[PDB]
Amino acid sequence: EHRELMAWNRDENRRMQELRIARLQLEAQAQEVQKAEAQAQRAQEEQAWV
């Protein structure tokens, strides 16, 4: 019974790890889009400042 519970524990940890990668993946897409826009403003401001 101990071994079965220790196997179920690892499965629960992997199931949550899969969700973590899915959530962090979505953030990378959204944050990347924002970063491109922010870099554009820096380019416009940097050119104006120069």
Partner: protein
């Protein structure tokens, strides 16, 4: 007014509500949690509300808590065999954390009842002795038996004072 927030946490009834009694293998439970964030809210409530209850039922287990050392909160149990059980409690409610640890490393209800019955094996209702250990100090208390001479005087013929006098007379 009792000091602090949620002063009910400092009552024996609340501490006795804990249901997680660890197996004898469990020796240490380190808690890594973050004080700031949104995915670690359940972990913070677990340290606030449940860690007192866990320690109360498991006095010999070392509970050591670490703050803001890792990106995510987790629980790591150290067993006597040398095994290390890592648990991930991110995005998990404090109630969910308690139920999870109970399942993997918590004694079952059947086991606990057997120990309670075994603990009282040497207490016998028939046994006589002090009130701390026994129901009745003396057999005089039982109904139908000869009552205590202090409460009720014994018949003259049942007294050593009377019997000694007759032997002198004989």
């Amino acid at each position: 007014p009792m000091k602090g927030r949620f002063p009910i946490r400092r009552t024996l009834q609340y501490l006795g509500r804990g249901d997680v009694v660890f197996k004898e293998s469990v020796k240490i439970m380190t808690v890594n949690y973050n004080t700031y964030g949104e995915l670690g809210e359940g972990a913070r409530k677990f340290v606030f509300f449940n860690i007192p209850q866990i320690q109360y039922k498991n006095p010999w287990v070392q509970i050591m808590m670490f703050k803001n050392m890792t990106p995510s909160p987790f629980l790591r149990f150290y067993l006597d065999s040398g095994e290390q059980v890592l648990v991930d409690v991110e995005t998990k409610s404090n109630k969910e954390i308690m139920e999870h640890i109970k399942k993997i490393l918590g004694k079952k209800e059947e086991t606990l009842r057997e120990e309670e019955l075994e603990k009282q094996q040497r207490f016998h209702p028939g046994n006589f002795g002090p009130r701390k250990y026994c129901l009745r100090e003396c057999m005089c208390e039982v109904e139908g038996q000869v009552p205590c001479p202090g409460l009720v005087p014994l018949p003259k013929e049942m007294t050593g004072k009377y019997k000694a006098a007759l032997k002198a007379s004989t």
